[PDB]
Amino acid sequence: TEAPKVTFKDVAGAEEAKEELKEIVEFLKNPSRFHEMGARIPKGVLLVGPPGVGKTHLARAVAGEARVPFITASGSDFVEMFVGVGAARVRDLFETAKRHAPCIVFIDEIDAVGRNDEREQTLNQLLVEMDGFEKDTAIVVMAATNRPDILDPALLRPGRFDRQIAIDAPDVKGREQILRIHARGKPLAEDVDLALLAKRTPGFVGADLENLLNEAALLAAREGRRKITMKDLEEAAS
Ligand SMILES: [Hg+2]
Numbered sequence: 001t002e003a004p005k006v007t008f009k010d011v012a013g014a015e016e017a018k019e020e021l022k023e024i025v026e027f028l029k030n031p032s033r034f035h036e037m038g039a040r041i042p043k044g045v046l047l048v049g050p051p052g053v054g055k056t057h058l059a060r061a062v063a064g065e066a067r068v069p070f071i072t073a074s075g076s077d078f079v080e081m082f083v084g085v086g087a088a089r090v091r092d093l094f095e096t097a098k099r100h101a102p103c104i105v106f107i108d109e110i111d112a113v114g115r116n117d118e119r120e121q122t123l124n125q126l127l128v129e130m131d132g133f134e135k136d137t138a139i140v141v142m143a144a145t146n147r148p149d150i151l152d153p154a155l156l157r158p159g160r161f162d163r164q165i166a167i168d169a170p171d172v173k174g175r176e177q178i179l180r181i182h183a184r185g186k187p188l189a190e191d192v193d194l195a196l197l198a199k200r201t202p203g204f205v206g207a208d209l210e211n212l213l214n215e216a217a218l219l220a221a222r223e224g225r226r227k228i229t230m231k232d233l234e235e236a237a238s
């Protein structure tokens with residue numbers, strides 16, 4: 001019931017995405033206004049971009065910026081459940097979401113569902129739940145993927161995820177943020193400059209930054225060293 005603490009001011013980069021999401025935010029902040037105005041918002045937004053680019057974080061920031069609940073679920077989990085259970089769970093998800101107007105329902109790993117009885121049954125239920133939305137339903141469904149081209153076309157038809165928003169690799173601030181988060185718990189030498197590390201890793205995604213630190217940690221750990229140095233980070237980079 002408590003909206004996330006994360007807001008747009010906490011999201012580095014994604015400047016274009018934020019612009020395109022302004023409309024969703026304003027709707028979530030005052031759904032009654034858009035209803036009375038007879039306006040019409042998507043209700044289905046797909047964030048497109050590579051893994052470790054901050055897609056989930058941004059979606060959470062939308063709920064935070066609008067100070068509205070952020071209800072999460074995983075397409076992966078749904079499909080892992082017994083045949084029919086994933087569908088039943090999809091059903092439970094939207095029934096619960098409807099008791100919290102307005103809100104954001106975020107389906108993680110939509111690829112698992114949109115890309116086998118389990119998957120199909122889960123997908124058909126999601127399709128039905130989305131078509132089941134009335135123009136008055138104060139719900140915005142968000143999802144994320146990097147391969148929108150191999151996604152079941154049905155998920156992109158009008159009334160569903162008919163709004164896509166590109167999310168590129170993190171900018172220098174995004175990378176620094178990712179690096180600082182993953183550096184927690186790792187002993188760094190005084191000469192370690194995470195800000196410089198971010199500047200010198202343009203194009204890197206969350207996974208690369210994570211393996212860079214882990215690989216630096218392993219080197220220092222293997223050589224029996226007590227602290228990770230800037231050189232270790234530079235060596236682990238490639
Ligand atoms: Hg809702």
Ligand SMILES: [Hg+2]
Nearest residue numbers: 052178181206
């Ligand atoms: Hg991360």
